[PDB]
Paper text:
The PA4C/H2-Db structure confirmed the Cys at P4 of the PA4C peptide is exposed for potential TCR binding and the overall structure is similar to PA/H-2Db 42, with a root mean square deviation on the MHC cleft of 0.34 Å and on the peptide of 0.21 Å. We noted the P4-Cys rotamer in the S-S bond was distinct from the P4-Cys rotamer in the unbound PA4C/H2-Db structure and in the 6218 TCR-PA4C/H2-Db complex.
Numbering used by the authors:
A (entry chain B): 0 to 99
B (entry chain C): 1 to 10
C (entry chain A): 0 to 15, 18 to 280
């Protein structure tokens, strides 16, 4: 058995411009096994309207999914992705950085 | 066209 | 790019409820069909719109085959519990990759049949499509069973025949869409650091297919270990994104260039950072 921890990237579909509608993405990949818990957060709170792509796996057998929601970037709101998987002892929180 | 595996299982 | 290919990536996951079985087909690395046992009405469905050129008989036949595969993976997961002296419980994952690369004579170039159990290589069919390579002791049991029962001939017949015949049909039907490319839109951004130095980030956005090369140069010479790259990621609209960054001294920004290579670009793009116009 080889378990692999998720790789996480949090980013927007389009270059962020405050006050302009966009999509917030949380791309989770390179993990094994396939069960995974992902939440998108706004000011530390769980976003309810979150969609996700269907499960797929790469040539190294590891799984990947995309979680996403429509959003409008602002100066004051903080966005993040919270991921949990069997390889972790606690959820990992990755903050959205509009420059990454 | 998807594959039908052979009658021998793992 | 390169030879055309078809692949079917199959997974069966047992859970603490019968296993979940997922089958995903790809043509040229693009998902084109999908079956999931956890769906309300489990059936193979078109994932690429050009697959709707197929009639209703195709979907029914593919669905019936998925029902057979679901049972094969269910029995195989059960045998795998026995091989590792375990009783039923928890979660176990059995995966399979199979398919073909198309040669310049439109016949099989390379055939693939590989299995993994618990994220580890388990057994694979060799390049000769006649012999097997087992990765552990449990896999040696499967290997002897498959060698003694003539399993390789069954897979070889599919890979050399049916797999390549249907790939040609799909390439013909999906031709218009399959040749389509979305060139990356590229730009360079400038970011502050800790002491006044600058991060230059070269962005390639909205490109399709996902294959891309991003490079940085200092006076035309390629930069290697000083370059930070992110893994290519989906934009969510079917296109992809990637970036590569370099940390440069302030005022030395113009000595650096980024070059992006992509099959959508007739010529690679060469760009540099320029301060944007402001009011
Ligand atoms: Na930008
Ligand atoms: Na809030
Ligand atoms: Na919200
Ligand atoms: Na068929
Ligand atoms: Na069960
Ligand atoms: Na693939
Ligand atoms: Na089912
Ligand atoms: Na899409």
């Amino acid at each position: 058995m080889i378990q692999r921890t998720p790789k996480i990237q949090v980013y927007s579909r389009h270059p962020a411009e405050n006050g302009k509608s966009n999509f917030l993405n949380c791309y989770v990949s390179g993990f094994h096994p396939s069960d995974i818990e992902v939440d998108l957060l706004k000011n530390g709170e769980r976003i309810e309207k979150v969609e996700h792509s269907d499960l797929s796996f790469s040539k190294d057998w590891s799984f990947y999914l995309l979680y996403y929601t429509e959003f409008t970037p602002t100066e004051k709101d903080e966005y993040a992705c919270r991921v949990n998987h069997v390889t972790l002892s606690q959820p990992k929180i990755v903050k959205w950085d509009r420059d990454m | 066209s998807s594959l039908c595996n052979f009658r021998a299982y793992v | 790019m390169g030879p055309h290919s078809m692949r079917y990536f199959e997974t069966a996951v047992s859970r603490p409820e019968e296993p979940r079985y997922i089958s995903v087909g790809y043509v040229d690395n693009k998902e084109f069909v999908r079956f999931d046992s956890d769906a309300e009405n489990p059936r193979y469905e078109p994932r690429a719109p050009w697959m709707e050129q197929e009639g209703p008989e195709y979907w029914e036949r593919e669905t019936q085959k998925a029902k057979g595969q679901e049972q094969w993976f269910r029995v195989s997961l059960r045998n795998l519990l026995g091989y590792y002296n375990q009783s039923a419980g928890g979660s176990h994952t059995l995966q399979q990759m199979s398919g073909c690369d198309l040669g310049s004579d439109w016949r099989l170039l390379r055939g693939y049949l590989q299995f993994a159990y618990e994220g580890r290589d388990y057994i694979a069919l060799n390049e000769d499509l006649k012999t097997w390579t087992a990765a552990d002791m449990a896999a040696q049991i499967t290997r002897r069973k498959w060698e003694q029962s003539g399993a390789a001939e069954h897979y070889k017949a599919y890979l050399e025949g049916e797999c390549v015949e249907w790939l040609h049909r799909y390439l013909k039907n999906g031709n218009a869409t399959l040749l389509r490319t979305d060139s990356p839109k590229a730009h360079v951004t400038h970011h502050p650091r800790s002491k006044g130095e600058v991060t230059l980030r070269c962005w390639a956005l909205g490109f399709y297919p996902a294959d891309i090369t991003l490079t940085w140069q200092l006076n035309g010479e390629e930069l290697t270990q000083d370059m930070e790259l992110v893994e290519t990621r989906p934009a969510g609209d079917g296109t992809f994104q990637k970036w590569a960054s370099v940390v440069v001294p302030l005022g030395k920004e113009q000595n650096y260039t980024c070059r992006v290579y992509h099959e959508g670009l007739p010529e690679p793009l060469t760009l540099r950072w320029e301060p944007p116009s402001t009011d």
